[PDB]
Design a protein around this ligand. Structure first.
Ligand SMILES: FC(F)(F)c1cccc(CN2CCc3[nH]cnc3C2)c1
Ligand SMILES: [Ca+2]
Length: 223
């Protein structure tokens, strides 16, 4: 997250870190056994780390649970990033408490202008590289479809939305991939892509979660 703020420990209780020897992606806990992330975060050997603040220090609220199955969306295209969504099932159910909690799926899509919270352990620099230990947060509005399409000619599908600031300075970034965009207490987006980070006229692009609720629910119901 570039241009954000320190969230505060366990203030984003649905935020997960995906770990394969190191943090490599975020995700969102959606029930005691399932995490939503980006399809571009797929790899084998995932350990889901819940209750994290400092990802380099065991602070006492963590739960570390290995993935038993990952399911990349059937229509994910890794070239275009269309349908950039994945489900990860935990080997055992997370213990839910104030600091480890699931985030509700949307019942309806969110409109341009809606204020959201984006979070992660990604790069905090727009030029250069610095990776934080503690969770970073950014408040950002959803941008209009027309301005998203203007920013990224030929690249925005109906399964994507832009959020952030056309002036630059505030954005998600590398390492935030797969993490949450939460608006009015619902998971509306997944950190998907951009062109660099925090550049003028290049806002972050997010997977449009509301389009996938049926798929998520029926996948969970049979897996
Ligand atoms: F794993 C990487 F690094 F190869 C990768 C591939 C595709 C996408 C991404 C995530 N985006 C990075 C740029 C950006 N700018 C605003 N948001 C993002 C997220 C990472
Ligand atoms: Ca920790």
């Amino acid at each position: 997250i570039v241009g954000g703020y320190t969230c505060g420990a366990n203030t984003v209780p649905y935020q997960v870190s995906l770990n394969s020897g190191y943090h490599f992606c975020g995700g969102s806990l959606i029930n005691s056994q399932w995490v939503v992330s980006a399809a571009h975060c797929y790899k084998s050997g995932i350990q889901v780390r819940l209750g994290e603040d400092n990802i380099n220090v065991v602070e006492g609220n963590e739960q570390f649970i290995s993935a038993s199955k990952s399911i990349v969306h059937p229509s994910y295209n890794s070239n275009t990033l269309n349908n950039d969504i994945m489900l990860i099932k935990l080997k055992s159910a997370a213990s839910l408490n104030s600091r480890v909690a699931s985030i509700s799926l949307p019942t309806s899509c969110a409109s341009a202008g809606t204020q959201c919270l984006i979070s992660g352990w990604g790069n905090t620099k727009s030029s250069g590289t610095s990776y934080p230990d503690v969770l970073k947060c950014l408040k950002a509005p959803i941008l209009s479809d027309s301005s998203c399409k203007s920013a990224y000619p030929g690249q925005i599908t109906s399964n994507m939305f832009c959020a952030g600031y056309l002036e630059g300075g505030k954005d998600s970034c590398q390492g935030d991939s797969g993490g949450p965009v939460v608006c009015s207490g619902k998971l509306q987006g997944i950190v998907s892509w951009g062109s660099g980070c925090a550049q003028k006229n290049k806002p972050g692009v997010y997977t449009k979660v509301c389009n996938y609720v049926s798929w998520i629910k029926q996948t969970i119901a049979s897996n």
